[model samples]
Target: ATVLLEVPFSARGDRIPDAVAELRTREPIRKVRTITGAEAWLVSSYALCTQVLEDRRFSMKETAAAGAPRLNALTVPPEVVNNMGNIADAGLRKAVMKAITPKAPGLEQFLRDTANSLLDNLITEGAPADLRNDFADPLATALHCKVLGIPQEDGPKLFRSLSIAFMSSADPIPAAKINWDRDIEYMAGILENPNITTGLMGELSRLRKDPAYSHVSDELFATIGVTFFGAGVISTGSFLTTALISLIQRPQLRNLLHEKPELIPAGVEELLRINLSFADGLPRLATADIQVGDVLVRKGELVLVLLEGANFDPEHFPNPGSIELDRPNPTSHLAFGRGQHFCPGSALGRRHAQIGIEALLKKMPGVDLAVPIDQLVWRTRFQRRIPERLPVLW
Candidate 1:
């Protein structure tokens, strides 16, 4: 009897596991067991992954339905699963999007300055620093605070909430709920605080008082703050951390980036294409009987969109593992996802990584991993495939 392969293949964020490529070749959309012990249709090929993601019948919200198969248990309440929809439903989408845009005056400067400052500290402290904790994560936290209009000092606790906030577990995590309630209370308090009058939360606070939008509930306001902070920080931090690993392993490319800063955006795009930040496949519940590859995913069945499967497919991205600066379809990868649920913070996320890499290369041209690549402790049972601490030297 052939045993079903259990995902996430491995916790190592440094490389795409061999299993992914093999499965993509053999059976792109095959049944697999998840951590929850639930069986899901793992859509692996580039075409099928895009088909599932583009189709509205593959529902992200429906994955939270009671008794439905799950990739993992909900870290937030079931209602919060559709957080973006809630924001749109409340008519706050425009305001929210505007605040998070990287084009906001001084936003790019803030990212650059923050990146340099963190690098400066590391240089002064000497070598063997944990880049994930000291650089990538702190920069991510600062950016989120600036975007959300929260106090910079208030970021650590909010960042702390995310360890539990983004766990992928077989069963409900009690600490996740505890942290969720507490962080929600904190966000609710922010809405009432008079001093908050600048970033996203500030704009949302004004909307809360506007007679035209007076019908919006305070819970939605609080949920917005907590969700955005957690999602943005976790995503940007994990991505930049993994991207750094990719660059370090390829010294030739890293030096090239340092010399020609103009190529940073393209380089960042390549990094995004091959990023292993997502530990597990993007999960969606099928809303109808749909054909994906040779399999018919029935209504209420769980379907996981394996992003790496699409990203690393040899047919779509020739030499898929290489970081080519000029791939014509570079942006086509499903790193941020596709369809109606495409990542809203994608622009900000890109800017954050771009600025971080630029500043880092300029500051430390010789940066490399202090420990052996395999020695880096990869975090497991967490939402993102990040190393516990990215130890590096320059």
Candidate 2:
């Protein structure tokens, strides 16, 4: 059966919610051709989407494995495809989580000071600012830099390199290769410095001395920088920008949030549920023939779960289109995903959004879109959905 895939830019507004609802009722797991000519199963139901995400039978690693289904022409290494799950040692995950978590107590002041300093700089830059570049991008880069012990001055260059390497669609593979070489060399230089302050790297060095974890130290250390750079900068920047855009578009919601500043944490959950970052879910390959909601997914077949569709499904979220700040069970959203592959940086991301929005709203309560809404541009077909620029005036 042929499914109508909306043109990239045309997939917005109320139409997004409508299309998702239609698909859920008409064809929950229908085969669809992607813009890139890849054939894959599009899972739209809430239950099936959750099943596809959490079931061990579906393998993210297999997407890159030999003889597995290919979602696109881009060929990433198997290790890179499932890097998150490949870390066999739970201690390393805990250690990495410990370093990034705001609950660590020691990192609380640093997070606050960093966020405030970034906000201060953003305000100084004047109003009618593009939040993506002016606020979210810088703040995310700074956070990653702080956690990785990288110099603040180097943040911009690193972000630029990453943007070209990962986010860009024009020959991203070559761009990634070039940046990967440079980044590894640069990180090695930082590791050589004995005076480098304690951070994730310092923790990794400490882990290396332990006999149990020493075997995976090299691999884990390499991933620490990648995770910090990729997840740290991009996801944070995208979510921060998206959350602000959601608030700006819905003044009533914004006012509701403004009235109860303490609602920032709950507001974060609501924002994440409504504003999905990934347009297409991460590619997962079938380990064997399996039935998902009456549809037979063949071994080696690729599946793309529509995250926004699943999250907004009326079956799961009542009146999903409307932003209910006080919605009970707001935590059920799959913004950071579910199961073993769930985002480890979820807590940090939530804190960043909560604190960042709180700071912006408190300082600039009158902030509104500076340009006509129709005139605004969005990043086209990128993994993350973000406004190309959000011009806001206080």
Candidate 3:
């Protein structure tokens, strides 16, 4: 029988399991069973994961493609997803980049303000508040709205609608339909009218007027808005909360950050590498015959970039369990991924975490997890592991 590992790889106390470690060392590339009962090559080495992720032969186009191993039944239709992110258009991709580009100076200040604003509420609520819920979720979701051109006031509830509609695993079709209708109708109201004065929506609203963006539809605009809240918000919440939990556990580390603000950026990168928000794996499909180490991933076969495994590889980073700022190419960790579909929000994500950590340290230096490591609830989803609540006390 082939060595079968648990989908979450039997994580023990938030550390990579020994089971996965053994597999990575012995079978860097081997056919393994996924939690979904599908069999495919599980790439665990740092170099191999990086290679597969960067290879154009691997496509994320049809994740739930026919004869593939699906993590879950996709609720969104293929055409809609194509419209959202998968459709191949170099110019349109360029245009879309211009729309939600998060690299502006004023935008940086806006995100900082949002982080502090939420931190203010968090401190007001006092100790024993859940950092993930009270601070990270609200801050990230509200910013998600701002980017998509939604009014700040409307983001939270809509984010709630989005979470239920998109994240709900118990038959998400109805929920997805519910938010799809409400959000589409809502955005359609403004997009069909004159451009707003600011935010991502305005830029996109004006861009919609150009012939180069002729593929634009009311549905497409609203889909982007939904994606802003759905994909964008939780990722920040997951990474920030996990990193905060790590910081709170190590008291001196918090002081180190507070004493040396200049260290924050590098610290954030280290945090991303260790926590590796994509705990499950980066799902992709092989386009042609590919030799990955000893095993061959034939065309149309399923493959997943074992991101956590790659990050923890001892050869790649000595004593990979701990953060070392000395890596010549610190950003080489494959955390946000590589190649064509590399994370667009990487800069924004890093900025969010950096600011989020700074605001937390400044506002609630005494923050500590209310419960022990084993007591906190975990979602344990196939691709992403998120804590439901992270109650902290000053």
Top candidate on lDDT is: 1
lDDT string, candidate 3, 1-394, tens digits: 9566545464332566776678789998777666567766778889889889888787777665766665444556656545435423414465456556677557768878888887787678776788888888887887677777667787776777644543424233677677767877777675765646466667667767778777756567666656556677877777888888778877887888888878989888888888855656676788899888988889887787888788888888778888765676678787787776787677778888898898888877777888887887766542356677888887
Q: What digit string (tens of lDDT, one per residue) describes model 1 on residues 287-392?
A: 8999888898899999999899999999999999999998999899999999989999999999999999999999999999999998998888998999999999
Off by over 4 Å in 3: 1-4, 10-13, 80-90, 162-173, 193-195
Q: Indicate the TM-score of model 1.
A: 0.99
- State each candidate's clash count: 0, 0, 0
A best-first ranking of the candidates according to their TM-score comes to: 1, 2, 3
Deviation in angstroms for 178 in model 3? 3.0
TM-score for each model:
0.99, 0.91, 0.91
The lDDT values for all models are 0.93, 0.73, 0.72
Q: Is candidate 2 or candidate 3 better by lDDT?
A: 2
**Candidate 1: Cα lDDT at 136:** 98
